[PDB]
From a paper:
Evidence accumulated over the past two decades has identified titin as a main coordinator of cardiac muscle homeostasis, and its dysfunction through genetic mutation as an important factor in cardiomyopathy. For this, we examined the unique mSNP T2850I in the I-band domain of titin I10, as a paradigm of an alteration in a general component of the titin chain. Domain I10 does not support specific interactions or have any known specialized roles, so it does not constitute an a priori sensitive locus of the chain. In previous studies, we have shown that the T2580I mSNP destabilizes the affected immunoglobulin (Ig) domain in titin, I10, and speculated that this instability increases the vulnerability of titin to proteolysis in situ potentially leading to myocardial damage.
A three-dimensional model from (c) was to 1.9 Å with Rfactor/Rfree = 19.28/22.83%; and from (d) to 1.53 Å with an Rfactor/Rfree = 16.15/19.65%. Three molecular copies were obtained in two space groups that agreed in showing I9–I11 in an extended conformation. In I9–I11, the component domains follow a regular arrangement, where domains display relative torsion angles of 45°–68° and are connected by short, two-residue sequences (TL and PI, respectively). In each Ig-pair, the domain interface is consistently formed by the A'B β-turn of the N-terminal domain slotting between the BC and FG loops of the C-terminal domain. Here, domains interact directly through a limited number of contacts (section S2).
Numbering used by the authors: 4 to 263
The structure:
Amino acid sequence: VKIIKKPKDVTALENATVAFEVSVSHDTVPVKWFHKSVEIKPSDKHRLVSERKVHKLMLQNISPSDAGEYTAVVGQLECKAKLFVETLHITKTMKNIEVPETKTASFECEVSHFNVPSMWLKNGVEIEMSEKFKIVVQGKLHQLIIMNTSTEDSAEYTFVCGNDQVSATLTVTPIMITSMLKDINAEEKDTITFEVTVNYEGISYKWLKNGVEIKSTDKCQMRTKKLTHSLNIRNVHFGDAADYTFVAGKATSTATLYVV
């Protein structure tokens, strides 16, 4: 009896199902399979199937323990093939971030394979995605986005990949109002400007008049150069006299406009 087809090497992922097959010239021929010098038996992991001239060994839910050389013995005839078992792992680490308050922070890591489930932890606890936490997957790149950061977002963040994991820390830096609002004594019809300076660029802020948020009309313009924020109020009259507040993250500053 002659071997017509020999088994081929197989590369597969952990937990995948794989097979090896030999085919022979004659129908009634018994076959044994060996791994690590031991004869393979039917089990929850091993299935042996014959169809006339074709003999198959099937392995379910493979583990790294299953990798290596398998041998098919047909009489005195013996042929070998190898299983390589690939495992999920992290291929690039994450960098610690420091981010100003209110700005967006992002962690990224790369994994070994496509179609890995995203799994992100904050101080050991699974993060449920929300308007705050955005999870993105781009092929083998996994990204965690944390929007509108606060000091409460400062923590250790972990990405889990199979049995592999990688951690990095986020540090959220508070906004500081370096140059505060000063009171303004103006005459009717004057154009005035409240100005503040902060320590970071591109932060979120709000202006308030007596506590109610202002929107920039032709009457109240809000401008922003580098770190300087301004509230310009044109053609000032008595209804413009009030308390004005600049709010940025947890940083606040109030002053008064007086109109003669």
